Structures are given as structure tokens and as C-alpha cells.
Design a protein around this motif. Structure first.
Motif, mmCIF file in Angstrom:
data_model
loop_
_atom_site.group_PDB
_atom_site.id
_atom_site.type_symbol
_atom_site.label_atom_id
_atom_site.label_comp_id
_atom_site.label_asym_id
_atom_site.label_seq_id
_atom_site.Cartn_x
_atom_site.Cartn_y
_atom_site.Cartn_z
ATOM 1 N N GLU A 127 3.413 -1.084 8.497
ATOM 2 C CA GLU A 127 3.143 0.221 7.743
ATOM 3 C C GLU A 127 3.977 0.364 6.447
ATOM 4 N N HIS B 56 0.092 4.358 0.886
ATOM 5 C CA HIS B 56 0.200 4.219 1.987
ATOM 6 C C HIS B 56 -0.889 3.438 2.959
ATOM 7 N N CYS C 175 -0.868 11.273 8.899
ATOM 8 C CA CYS C 175 -0.808 10.026 9.687
ATOM 9 C C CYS C 175 -0.850 10.117 11.216
ATOM 10 N N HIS D 38 0.618 6.928 15.195
ATOM 11 C CA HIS D 38 2.032 6.950 16.054
ATOM 12 C C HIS D 38 1.412 7.714 17.439
ATOM 13 N N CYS E 255 7.390 7.155 10.843
ATOM 14 C CA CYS E 255 6.344 6.867 10.183
ATOM 15 C C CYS E 255 6.774 6.509 8.838
ATOM 16 N N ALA E 256 6.283 5.389 8.211
ATOM 17 C CA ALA E 256 6.705 4.987 6.769
ATOM 18 C C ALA E 256 6.534 6.180 5.700
HETATM 19 ZN ZN LIG Z 1 2.619 6.728 9.973
#
Ligand SMILES: [Zn+2]
Length: 198
Positions: free
Chosen positions: A36, A49, A143, A146, A158-159
Motif C-alpha cells: 500500500e 493511493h 480505506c 484493513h 494504513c498508508a
Molecule cells: Zn489503507
């Protein structure tokens, strides 16, 4: 690998970034096998992203249970070749802000992007994640990758959200201009299984 049209679309979408503006970068997975990646411009809210299927499974399983909580099955439909395609077309001599520059320096070097400079904000562990709960409360919808229970039981990494909370910690408030993705879902993911007819 991207198609000719996918390549033109990505480059066009990436040009929406101001090459001079403050820009964060964060990654999940090791730099030789990232899963990610997030490149974020806090002032305008724009972010790149995307995801990547891993090659080393044993590590991935470790990273899933102790860091990002991603289920590998959720990565089967992600578009391949995005990591090299994005990194290749980032502006010449760009400067990127980050939290821990070791792995990201390795990743950029592997792409022969030594011209890209890094600014490590080098905050302390907990100072960097001061606003973790609030950032997750507001931006969880951005996102949903996860899904697993992470233990160190803690909040998964999370990136994207890490970029947002790092910006928040630097400025001293979870109050940032609205984050908006610059990439279409059709570029991040491959058209998945057909709708179940109900
Ligand atoms: Zn993420």
C-alpha cells in the motif's frame, strides 16, 4: 503492467499535483515488496493511493497480523504495475516529507529516483499518532482494506491514514482540508466478479 490508455490516464491524473507543494509519502509492506502506497498534498487534500499484491507470503502474513491487517484475498483484484508506473512519473527533483525515511529511500533508489529528496520529520512514535483515533473516526471510509485483528489489539496501519495523522501531528490538529483521491477506482482495481443477480 498498465495499458497505453491506463498509462495516459495515470500521468494525466498525477499532473493534478503541484510539484513544489508540501507532499507526504507513506508505504505498508517492506520496500522490496510494498502492499500500500500513499502520496498526499495536505494543502489541497489531493492524494495518490494504491495497492499491490505481495510476492513474499510469509512476511505478508506477519505484516497482516502485526501491522496492516490486510487479507491477501482482497489484493487479488488490484491493478499490477502501479508502484513502478507512479514512481517513474513523479516530478523531476521532487521533495517528499515522511515519517521514517529508511525504507522509502530504498524504494525510490530501486526505481532509480535518487533525484527525489526526502525530509524525515522524525517525530517520536506516539507523537506521530496523537490523533490516530480521530483520523480513523473521520476517514475510515477512505480505506476498507484493513479487515484483520492487529496485535502489538491495536488500530491497523494504513498508508493513507498515516499520512493524514502525520500531517495532523505536524500542524497540531486533526483539522485538515478534505482529502480527495486523484486516482479512479477503475485504475486502482481490476473490474472484479460480476454482480450476484438478486
Ligand atoms: Zn489503507
Amino acid at each position: 503492467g498498465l495499458t497505453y490508455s491506463q498509462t495516459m490516464e495515470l500521468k494525466d491524473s498525477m499532473l493534478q499535483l503541484d510539484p513544489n507543494a508540501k507532499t507526504w509519502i507513506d508505504i505498508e509492506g517492506r520496500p522490496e515488496d510494498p502492499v500500500e502506497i500513499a502520496i498526499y498534498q495536505p494543502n489541497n487534500g489531493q492524494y495518490i493511493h494504491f495497492y499491490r499484491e505481495p510476492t513474499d507470503i510469509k512476511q505478508f502474513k506477519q505484516d497482516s497480523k502485526h501491522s496492516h491487517g490486510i487479507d491477501i484475498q482482497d489484493l487479488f483484484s488490484v491493478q499490477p504495475g502501479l508502484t513502478s508506473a507512479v514512481i517513474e512519473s513523479l516530478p523531476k527533483n521532487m521533495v517528499l516529507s515522511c515519517q521514517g525515511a529508511d525504507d522509502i529511500r530504498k524504494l525510490l533508489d530501486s526505481q532509480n529516483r535518487r533525484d527525489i529528496k526526502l525530509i524525515d520529520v522524525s517525530m517520536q512514535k506516539d507523537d506521530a499518532r496523537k490523533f490516530e483515533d480521530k483520523i480513523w473516526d473521520e476517514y475510515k471510509h477512505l480505506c476498507r482494506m484493513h479487515t484483520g485483528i492487529v496485535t502489538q489489539e491495536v488500530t491497523p496501519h494504513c498508508a493513507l491514514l498515516d499520512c493524514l495523522m502525520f500531517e495532523a501531528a505536524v500542524i497540531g490538529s486533526p483539522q485538515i482540508p478534505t482529502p480527495r483521491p486523484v486516482l479512479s477506482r477503475d485504475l486502482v482495481f481490476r473490474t472484479g466478479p460480476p454482480r450476484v443477480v438478486l
